[PDB]
Design an enzyme around this catalytic site. Structure first.
Site, PDB file in Angstrom:
ATOM      1  N   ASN A 290     -77.815  55.930  37.632  1.00 46.73           N
ATOM      2  CA  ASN A 290     -76.468  56.050  37.031  1.00 46.73           C
ATOM      3  C   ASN A 290     -75.399  55.722  38.065  1.00 46.73           C
ATOM      4  O   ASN A 290     -75.542  56.048  39.270  1.00 46.73           O
ATOM      5  CB  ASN A 290     -76.257  57.427  36.410  1.00 46.73           C
ATOM      6  CG  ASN A 290     -75.781  58.445  37.418  1.00 46.73           C
ATOM      7  OD1 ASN A 290     -74.580  58.549  37.671  1.00 46.73           O
ATOM      8  ND2 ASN A 290     -76.723  59.165  38.038  1.00 46.73           N
TER       9      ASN A 290
ATOM     10  N   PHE B 185     -67.830  59.696  37.981  1.00 46.54           N
ATOM     11  CA  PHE B 185     -67.043  60.922  37.672  1.00 46.54           C
ATOM     12  C   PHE B 185     -66.114  60.664  36.481  1.00 46.54           C
ATOM     13  O   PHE B 185     -64.885  60.944  36.576  1.00 46.54           O
ATOM     14  CB  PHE B 185     -66.187  61.386  38.858  1.00 46.54           C
ATOM     15  CG  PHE B 185     -66.880  62.116  39.979  1.00 46.54           C
ATOM     16  CD1 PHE B 185     -68.095  62.766  39.805  1.00 46.54           C
ATOM     17  CD2 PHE B 185     -66.258  62.207  41.215  1.00 46.54           C
ATOM     18  CE1 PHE B 185     -68.693  63.445  40.856  1.00 46.54           C
ATOM     19  CE2 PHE B 185     -66.848  62.904  42.257  1.00 46.54           C
ATOM     20  CZ  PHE B 185     -68.067  63.518  42.078  1.00 46.54           C
TER      21      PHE B 185
ATOM     22  N   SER C 227     -71.954  62.731  45.412  1.00 41.10           N
ATOM     23  CA  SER C 227     -72.041  61.593  44.465  1.00 41.10           C
ATOM     24  C   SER C 227     -72.098  60.286  45.237  1.00 41.10           C
ATOM     25  O   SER C 227     -71.256  60.031  46.096  1.00 41.10           O
ATOM     26  CB  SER C 227     -70.912  61.536  43.522  1.00 41.10           C
ATOM     27  OG  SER C 227     -71.035  60.377  42.704  1.00 41.10           O
TER      28      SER C 227
ATOM     29  N   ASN D  17     -71.335  57.503  43.862  1.00 39.87           N
ATOM     30  CA  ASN D  17     -70.590  56.611  42.933  1.00 39.87           C
ATOM     31  C   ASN D  17     -69.074  56.775  43.091  1.00 39.87           C
ATOM     32  O   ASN D  17     -68.351  56.225  42.238  1.00 39.87           O
ATOM     33  CB  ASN D  17     -71.046  56.844  41.491  1.00 39.87           C
ATOM     34  CG  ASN D  17     -72.538  56.641  41.355  1.00 39.87           C
ATOM     35  OD1 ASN D  17     -73.072  55.689  41.930  1.00 39.87           O
ATOM     36  ND2 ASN D  17     -73.217  57.511  40.618  1.00 39.87           N
ATOM     37  N   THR D  18     -68.614  57.447  44.149  1.00 43.78           N
ATOM     38  CA  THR D  18     -67.171  57.526  44.519  1.00 43.78           C
ATOM     39  C   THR D  18     -67.046  57.109  45.987  1.00 43.78           C
ATOM     40  O   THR D  18     -67.676  57.773  46.837  1.00 43.78           O
ATOM     41  CB  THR D  18     -66.586  58.914  44.214  1.00 43.78           C
ATOM     42  OG1 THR D  18     -66.631  59.110  42.803  1.00 43.78           O
ATOM     43  CG2 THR D  18     -65.152  59.076  44.671  1.00 43.78           C
TER      44      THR D  18
ATOM     45  N   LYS E  18     -73.199  70.904  47.392  1.00 44.23           N
ATOM     46  CA  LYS E  18     -74.285  70.044  46.874  1.00 44.23           C
ATOM     47  C   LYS E  18     -74.391  68.815  47.763  1.00 44.23           C
ATOM     48  O   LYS E  18     -73.380  68.098  47.931  1.00 44.23           O
ATOM     49  CB  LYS E  18     -74.038  69.626  45.430  1.00 44.23           C
ATOM     50  CG  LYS E  18     -75.210  68.858  44.829  1.00 44.23           C
ATOM     51  CD  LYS E  18     -75.119  68.760  43.336  1.00 44.23           C
ATOM     52  CE  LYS E  18     -76.243  67.961  42.720  1.00 44.23           C
ATOM     53  NZ  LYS E  18     -76.102  67.909  41.243  1.00 44.23           N
TER      54      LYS E  18
ATOM     55  N   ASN F  76     -78.552  65.940  45.201  1.00 46.81           N
ATOM     56  CA  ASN F  76     -77.991  64.910  44.294  1.00 46.81           C
ATOM     57  C   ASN F  76     -78.983  63.739  44.189  1.00 46.81           C
ATOM     58  O   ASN F  76     -80.103  63.777  44.748  1.00 46.81           O
ATOM     59  CB  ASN F  76     -76.612  64.477  44.787  1.00 46.81           C
ATOM     60  CG  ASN F  76     -75.649  64.153  43.667  1.00 46.81           C
ATOM     61  OD1 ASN F  76     -76.002  63.434  42.731  1.00 46.81           O
ATOM     62  ND2 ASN F  76     -74.430  64.691  43.758  1.00 46.81           N
TER      63      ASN F  76
HETATM   64  C1  LIG Z   1     -76.660  60.515  34.367  1.00 46.87           C
HETATM   65  C2  LIG Z   1     -76.463  61.476  35.507  1.00 46.87           C
HETATM   66  C3  LIG Z   1     -75.229  61.997  35.794  1.00 46.87           C
HETATM   67  C4  LIG Z   1     -75.040  62.888  36.844  1.00 46.87           C
HETATM   68  N1  LIG Z   1     -73.801  63.381  37.122  1.00 46.87           N
HETATM   69  C5  LIG Z   1     -73.643  64.315  38.089  1.00 46.87           C
HETATM   70  C6  LIG Z   1     -72.355  64.941  38.378  1.00 46.87           C
HETATM   71  O1  LIG Z   1     -71.340  64.688  37.656  1.00 46.87           O
HETATM   72  N2  LIG Z   1     -72.318  65.818  39.389  1.00 46.87           N
HETATM   73  C7  LIG Z   1     -73.383  66.157  40.173  1.00 46.87           C
HETATM   74  O2  LIG Z   1     -73.225  66.994  41.074  1.00 46.87           O
HETATM   75  N3  LIG Z   1     -74.596  65.631  39.954  1.00 46.87           N
HETATM   76  C8  LIG Z   1     -74.740  64.748  38.952  1.00 46.87           C
HETATM   77  N4  LIG Z   1     -75.981  64.193  38.709  1.00 46.87           N
HETATM   78  C9  LIG Z   1     -77.123  64.583  39.544  1.00 46.87           C
HETATM   79  C10 LIG Z   1     -77.996  65.664  38.972  1.00 46.87           C
HETATM   80  O3  LIG Z   1     -77.229  66.876  38.892  1.00 46.87           O
HETATM   81  C11 LIG Z   1     -79.206  65.941  39.861  1.00 46.87           C
HETATM   82  O4  LIG Z   1     -78.725  66.348  41.152  1.00 46.87           O
HETATM   83  C12 LIG Z   1     -80.111  64.705  40.014  1.00 46.87           C
HETATM   84  O5  LIG Z   1     -80.114  63.882  38.842  1.00 46.87           O
HETATM   85  C13 LIG Z   1     -81.547  65.087  40.365  1.00 46.87           C
HETATM   86  O6  LIG Z   1     -82.167  65.854  39.337  1.00 46.87           O
HETATM   87  P1  LIG Z   1     -83.157  65.172  38.238  1.00 46.87           P
HETATM   88  O7  LIG Z   1     -84.147  64.298  39.019  1.00 46.87           O
HETATM   89  O8  LIG Z   1     -83.801  66.354  37.584  1.00 46.87           O
HETATM   90  O9  LIG Z   1     -82.268  64.370  37.267  1.00 46.87           O
HETATM   91  C14 LIG Z   1     -76.188  63.307  37.641  1.00 46.87           C
HETATM   92  C15 LIG Z   1     -77.431  62.796  37.339  1.00 46.87           C
HETATM   93  C16 LIG Z   1     -77.598  61.904  36.299  1.00 46.87           C
HETATM   94  C17 LIG Z   1     -78.978  61.389  36.014  1.00 46.87           C
HETATM   95  O1  LIG Z   2     -71.564  58.929  38.819  1.00 42.36           O
HETATM   96  C1  LIG Z   2     -71.413  60.151  38.640  1.00 42.36           C
HETATM   97  O2  LIG Z   2     -70.512  60.676  38.003  1.00 42.36           O
HETATM   98  C2  LIG Z   2     -72.411  60.987  39.367  1.00 42.36           C
HETATM   99  C3  LIG Z   2     -73.678  60.513  39.445  1.00 42.36           C
HETATM  100  C4  LIG Z   2     -74.652  61.146  40.242  1.00 42.36           C
HETATM  101  O3  LIG Z   2     -75.820  60.770  40.302  1.00 42.36           O
HETATM  102  N1  LIG Z   2     -74.196  62.216  40.971  1.00 42.36           N
HETATM  103  C5  LIG Z   2     -72.923  62.721  40.964  1.00 42.36           C
HETATM  104  O4  LIG Z   2     -72.639  63.661  41.700  1.00 42.36           O
HETATM  105  N2  LIG Z   2     -72.015  62.038  40.160  1.00 42.36           N
END
Ligand SMILES: Cc1cc2nc3c(=O)[nH]c(=O)nc-3n(C[C@H](O)[C@H](O)[C@H](O)COP(=O)(O)O)c2cc1C
Ligand SMILES: O=C(O)c1cc(=O)[nH]c(=O)[nH]1
Ligand SMILES: CC(C)=CCC1=C(O)C(=O)c2ccccc2C1=O
Length: 365
Positions: free
Chosen positions: A114, A118, A184, A186-187, A224, A253
Site C-alpha cells: 500500500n 495517510f 509510514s 508513504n510520507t 510505532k 509497520n
Molecule cells: C492498507 C494498509 C494501510 C495501513 N495504514 C496504516 C496507518 O494508517 N497507520 C499505521 O500505523 N499503520 C498502517 N498500516 C500498517 C499496519 O498497521 C501493520 O503495521 C502492518 O500492515 C503489518 O501487519 P499485517 O502484516 O498484519 O498487515 C497499514 C497497513 C495496510 C496493509
Molecule cells: O500509506 C499509509 O497511509 C500507511 C501505510 C502503511 O503501510 N503504514 C502507515 O503507517 N501508513
C-alpha cells in the site's frame, strides 16, 4: 471450522476476483460498521487476558492501524472478536492521500503493498465520531476491550511535532493509548523522525501534551517503528524510550524492503509491504527491541500474523499483545477466532498458564 474454510477457500477469493483492493477495503469497512457479520462464536478464555498499558485486554489479538483509518467501524471490530481496536492514522487536517491505484494484492505471497499516504478525515471529524460513542467505549474498556488511536502528520506540515501535539490534545482524551506513528513509508521525511535527536524532541513534546490532560483522559503513549531500522536506529530508539518513560512500542509497520522470493506480479510497486513476507522481519524486530529495553517496555507485535503460531512466536519474542490486518484481507473475519483458538491450544501444549507467562519466554531459555 466450516466458516474459516468457506471464507478462506471460496468467499474471500471470489470477492477479491470481483473488486479492486481499495474498493474491497471500503466495502469491508462499511459491512463491519453496519454489523453485517455474525457475532464471533469464540468465547475468550481467562488464559488470553493481558494486563498492560494500565488496562485489561480480554484477548491479545487486536486490529492494526490502517483498517479503520477514520474510526467508522470500532463496534463492528469488537463484534469480530478483536481484544482491542486501533484506529488511524489520523492527520490534523483532512487530506486525500496519494493518487489511485495505491493498494495492491500479492496473492501468491499472502501480502499487500500500500501507498495510501495517510488518507484521513482529519482530527475534528474523528473527534466527533468517537465522542458519539465515548461512554459506550468507557464501558467496553472497563470490560477489557480498549481503544487505541494512531496519530499521523499532514503531507504539507512545517512542524511534525506540532501535528502530533494537536493529535494528543484532540484525540488523547478519547483514547486508552495513543500511537506516534513515525514509521509510514508513504510520507516523505516521516521515518527520519525515528532518528535520536528528532525522536527525543518530538516525544518530549508529545509526553508533555499527554501529561497536561486530566487523569481520566490521560492515555498511554506508544511509538510505532519500522522493520527497516539499522542496529544504530534501534539502539537510539530504545535509549530515548527508556530516558523519557514512553509507555510502549508497536513493532512493526510495513517494510520498504522486498524480500527475495516475492512472486506477486505487483512486487515492484512503491509502498509498504505487509503480510507473510514481513512476519519474521517483524518478530526479529520485537526480539531486538525487547532485549534493548530489558523487557520493561510493553510491545504490541504486528506483521504477518495469520495463525496462533504466528501470534505465539511474537509473544515469546517479547510482545504483550499482537495485531493483524493483512490476514483479515485474505481469510476474512473467521481468522480472528482461528488465531485465538490456535493460540490457546499452543499455550496449553507448551505448558504456559496463559499469555502473560509466555511474554518474552524465548529470552529466558
Ligand atoms: C492498507 C494498509 C494501510 C495501513 N495504514 C496504516 C496507518 O494508517 N497507520 C499505521 O500505523 N499503520 C498502517 N498500516 C500498517 C499496519 O498497521 C501493520 O503495521 C502492518 O500492515 C503489518 O501487519 P499485517 O502484516 O498484519 O498487515 C497499514 C497497513 C495496510 C496493509
Ligand atoms: O500509506 C499509509 O497511509 C500507511 C501505510 C502503511 O503501510 N503504514 C502507515 O503507517 N501508513
Ligand atoms: C473481499 C473484501 C470485500 C474485502 C477484503 C479486503 C481485500 O480484498 C483487500 O485487498 C484489502 C486491501 C487493503 C485493506 C483492506 C482490504 C480488505 O479488507
Amino acid at each position: 471450522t466450516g466458516d474459516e474454510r468457506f471464507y478462506a477457500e471460496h468467499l474471500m477469493p471470489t470477492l477479491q476476483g470481483l473488486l479492486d483492493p481499495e474498493s474491497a477495503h471500503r466495502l469491508a469497512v462499511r459491512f463491519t460498521s453496519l454489523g453485517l457479520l455474525p457475532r464471533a462464536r469464540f468465547q475468550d478464555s481467562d488464559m488470553l487476558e493481558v494486563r498492560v498499558l494500565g488496562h485489561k485486554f480480554r484477548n491479545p489479538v487486536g486490529i492494526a492501524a490502517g483498517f479503520d483509518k477514520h474510526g467508522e467501524a470500532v463496534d463492528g471490530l469488537y463484534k469480530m472478536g478483536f481484544g482491542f481496536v486501533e484506529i488511524g492514522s489520523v492527520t490534523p487536517k483532512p487530506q486525500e492521500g496519494n493518487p489511485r491505484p495505491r493498494v495492491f494484492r500479492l496473492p501468491e505471497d499472502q501480502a499487500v503493498i500500500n501507498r495510501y499516504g495517510f488518507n484521513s478525515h482529519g482530527l475534528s471529524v474523528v473527534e466527533h465520531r468517537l465522542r458519539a460513542r465515548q461512554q459506550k467505549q468507557a464501558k467496553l474498556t472497563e470490560d477489557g476491550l480498549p481503544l487505541g488511536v494512531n496519530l499521523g502528520k499532514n503531507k504539507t506540515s512545517v512542524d511534525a511535532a506540532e501535528d502530533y501535539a494537536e493529535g494528543v490534545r484532540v484525540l488523547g482524551p478519547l483514547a486508552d493509548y495513543l500511537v506516534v506513528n513515525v514509521s509510514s513509508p508513504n510520507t516523505a521525511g516521516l521515518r527520519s523522525l525515528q532518528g535520536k535527536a528528532e525522536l527525543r524532541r518530538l516525544l518530549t513534546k508529545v509526553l508533555q501534551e499527554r501529561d497536561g490532560l486530566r487523569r481520566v483522559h490521560r492515555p498511554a503513549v506508544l511509538v510505532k517503528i519500522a522493520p527497516d531500522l539499522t542496529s544504530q536506529d534501534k539502539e537510539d530508539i530504545a535509549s530515548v524510550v527508556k530516558e523519557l518513560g514512553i509507555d510502549g512500542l508497536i513493532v512493526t509497520n510495513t517494510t520498504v524492503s522486498r524480500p527475495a522470493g516475492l512472486q506477486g506480479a505487483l512486487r515492484s510497486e512503491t509502498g509498504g509491504l505487509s503480510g507473510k513476507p514481513l512476519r519474521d522481519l517483524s518478530t526479529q524486530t520485537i526480539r531486538e527491541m525487547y532485549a534493548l529495553t530489558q523487557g520493561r517496555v510493553p510491545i504490541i507485535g504486528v506483521g504477518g500474523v495469520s495463525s496462533g503460531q504466528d501470534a505465539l512466536e511474537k509473544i515469546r519474542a517479547g510482545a504483550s499483545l499482537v495485531q493483524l490486518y493483512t490476514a483479515l484481507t485474505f481469510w476474512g473475519p473467521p481468522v480472528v477466532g482461528k488465531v485465538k483458538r490456535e493460540l490457546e491450544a499452543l499455550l496449553k501444549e507448551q505448558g504456559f498458564g496463559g499469555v502473560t507467562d509466555a511474554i518474552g519466554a524465548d529470552h529466558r531459555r
